[PDB]
Design an enzyme around this catalytic site. Structure first.
Site, PDB file in Angstrom:
ATOM      1  N   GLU A   1       0.967  -1.357   0.402  1.00  0.00           N
ATOM      2  CA  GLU A   1       0.151   0.412   0.053  1.00  0.00           C
ATOM      3  C   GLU A   1       0.846   1.225  -0.236  1.00  0.00           C
ATOM      4  O   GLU A   1       0.928   2.359  -0.844  1.00  0.00           O
ATOM      5  CB  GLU A   1      -0.863   0.129   1.388  1.00  0.00           C
ATOM      6  CG  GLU A   1      -1.880  -1.127   0.988  1.00  0.00           C
ATOM      7  CD  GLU A   1      -3.061  -0.220  -0.274  1.00  0.00           C
ATOM      8  OE1 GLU A   1      -3.143   0.122   0.103  1.00  0.00           O
ATOM      9  OE2 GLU A   1      -4.421  -1.332  -0.417  1.00  0.00           O
TER      10      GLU A   1
ATOM     11  N   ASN B   1      -7.263  10.119  -5.543  1.00  0.00           N
ATOM     12  CA  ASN B   1      -8.428   8.918  -6.217  1.00  0.00           C
ATOM     13  C   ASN B   1      -8.716   9.760  -7.278  1.00  0.00           C
ATOM     14  O   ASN B   1      -9.222  11.045  -7.010  1.00  0.00           O
ATOM     15  CB  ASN B   1      -9.233   8.347  -5.298  1.00  0.00           C
ATOM     16  CG  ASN B   1      -8.333   7.091  -4.527  1.00  0.00           C
ATOM     17  OD1 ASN B   1      -8.330   7.657  -3.332  1.00  0.00           O
ATOM     18  ND2 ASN B   1      -7.203   6.730  -5.170  1.00  0.00           N
TER      19      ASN B   1
ATOM     20  N   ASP C   1     -12.180  10.049  -7.317  1.00  0.00           N
ATOM     21  CA  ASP C   1     -13.299  10.680  -6.444  1.00  0.00           C
ATOM     22  C   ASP C   1     -12.994  11.954  -5.760  1.00  0.00           C
ATOM     23  O   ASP C   1     -14.155  12.617  -5.274  1.00  0.00           O
ATOM     24  CB  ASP C   1     -13.679   9.137  -6.110  1.00  0.00           C
ATOM     25  CG  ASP C   1     -13.570   9.140  -4.897  1.00  0.00           C
ATOM     26  OD1 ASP C   1     -12.376   9.106  -5.142  1.00  0.00           O
ATOM     27  OD2 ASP C   1     -14.254   8.844  -3.777  1.00  0.00           O
TER      28      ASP C   1
ATOM     29  N   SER D   1     -10.752  11.947  -2.830  1.00  0.00           N
ATOM     30  CA  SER D   1     -10.837  11.602  -2.336  1.00  0.00           C
ATOM     31  C   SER D   1      -8.823  10.971  -2.042  1.00  0.00           C
ATOM     32  O   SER D   1      -8.418  11.525  -3.303  1.00  0.00           O
ATOM     33  CB  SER D   1     -11.402  10.746  -1.392  1.00  0.00           C
ATOM     34  OG  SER D   1     -10.938   9.219  -1.832  1.00  0.00           O
TER      35      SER D   1
ATOM     36  N   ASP E   1      -5.700   9.116  -0.844  1.00  0.00           N
ATOM     37  CA  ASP E   1      -5.573   7.657   0.512  1.00  0.00           C
ATOM     38  C   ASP E   1      -4.725   7.969   1.426  1.00  0.00           C
ATOM     39  O   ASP E   1      -2.945   8.770   0.636  1.00  0.00           O
ATOM     40  CB  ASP E   1      -5.132   6.582   0.221  1.00  0.00           C
ATOM     41  CG  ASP E   1      -6.221   6.215  -0.575  1.00  0.00           C
ATOM     42  OD1 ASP E   1      -7.442   5.815  -0.516  1.00  0.00           O
ATOM     43  OD2 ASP E   1      -6.558   5.452  -1.861  1.00  0.00           O
TER      44      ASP E   1
ATOM     45  N   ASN F   1      -8.224   5.819   3.584  1.00  0.00           N
ATOM     46  CA  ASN F   1      -9.025   6.739   2.441  1.00  0.00           C
ATOM     47  C   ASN F   1      -9.782   8.207   3.124  1.00  0.00           C
ATOM     48  O   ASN F   1     -10.511   7.395   4.116  1.00  0.00           O
ATOM     49  CB  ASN F   1     -10.592   6.290   1.575  1.00  0.00           C
ATOM     50  CG  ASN F   1     -10.692   6.328   0.915  1.00  0.00           C
ATOM     51  OD1 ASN F   1     -11.809   6.989   0.410  1.00  0.00           O
ATOM     52  ND2 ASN F   1     -10.061   7.173  -0.496  1.00  0.00           N
TER      53      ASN F   1
END
Length: 129
Positions: free
Chosen positions: A35, A46, A48, A50, A52, A59
């Site tokens: 990750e 991301n 959308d 958002s 991470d 998120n």
């Protein structure tokens, strides 16, 4: 902070992640490797809108507040920046809430695609635990 493999395993174990909800330590270390490559300062935006954050790429849509994800939740009740600290406490406490949510570790797509079903024990071999 970029953690060493065994250094992170020990830190996670100390924070109670070993066997948390039935997931052995190897699973959490494997998830962190893919990750964020063990980097607490890792961030990724991301499509959308958002983002991470941290070692476990938590998120902003649901778990933390970064002030720029409209109509998002802050279920972990923490600023997303707190997830980039060299102290993994905040990340760990939030991950525990996430993994208890319902889909377990499947919530992390790198774990689902690169750790699930593999010999995760290999991630802690050679470590003094």
């Amino acid at each position: 902070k970029v953690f060493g493999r065994c250094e992170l395993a020990a830190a996670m174990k100390r924070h109670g992640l070993d066997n948390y909800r039935g997931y052995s330590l190897g699973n959490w270390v494997c998830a962190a490797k893919f990750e964020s490559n063990f980097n607490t300062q890792a961030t990724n935006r991301n499509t959308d809108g958002s983002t991470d954050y941290g070692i476990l790429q938590i998120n902003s849509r649901w778990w933390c507040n970064d002030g720029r994800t409209p109509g998002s939740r802050n279920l972990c009740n923490i600023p997303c920046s707190a997830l980039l600290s060299s102290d993994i406490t905040a990340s760990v406490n939030c991950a525990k809430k996430i993994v208890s949510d319902g889909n377990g570790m499947n919530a992390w797509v790198a774990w689902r695609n690169r750790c699930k079903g593999t010999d995760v024990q290999a991630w802690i071999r050679g470590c003094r635990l």
